Amino acid sequence: GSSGSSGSRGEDRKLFVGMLGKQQTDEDVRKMFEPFGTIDECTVLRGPDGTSKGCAFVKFQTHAEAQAAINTLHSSRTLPGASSSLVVKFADTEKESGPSSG
């Protein structure tokens, strides 16, 4: 009842996608994630042989849009030859936490 789903911690547009296949690329993911918002920055994590390690970061135009995707995309479909479904969850960027004076 207009409550429950909405409410996630981590104010960060960027998102961490997993369970990706060599077939799926920035193009697919982008056009596949766009349907849930306008993407601005999309980078895929690959190795030396341009092989999709199985993860990619997505940066929507706004947070609201970011959550939208996950809400659904998250464990939604099961890309070809992929153990689990499309694992979509907010991403985390190195931070600086610690004592203020010392």
UniProtKB/Swiss-Prot annotation:
It is found in: Nucleus; Cytoplasm. Residues 13-93 form the RRM domain. Expressed in brain. It comes from the Eukaryota. RNA-binding protein involved in the regulation of pre-mRNA alternative splicing. Mediates exon inclusion and/or exclusion in pre-mRNA that are subject to tissue-specific and developmentally regulated alternative splicing. Specifically activates exon 5 inclusion of cardiac isoforms of TNNT2 during heart remodeling at the juvenile to adult transition. Activates the splicing of MAPT/Tau exon 10. Binds to muscle-specific splicing enhancer (MSE) intronic sites flanking the alternative exon 5 of TNNT2 pre-mRNA. Belongs to the CELF/BRUNOL family. This is CUGBP Elav-like family member 3.
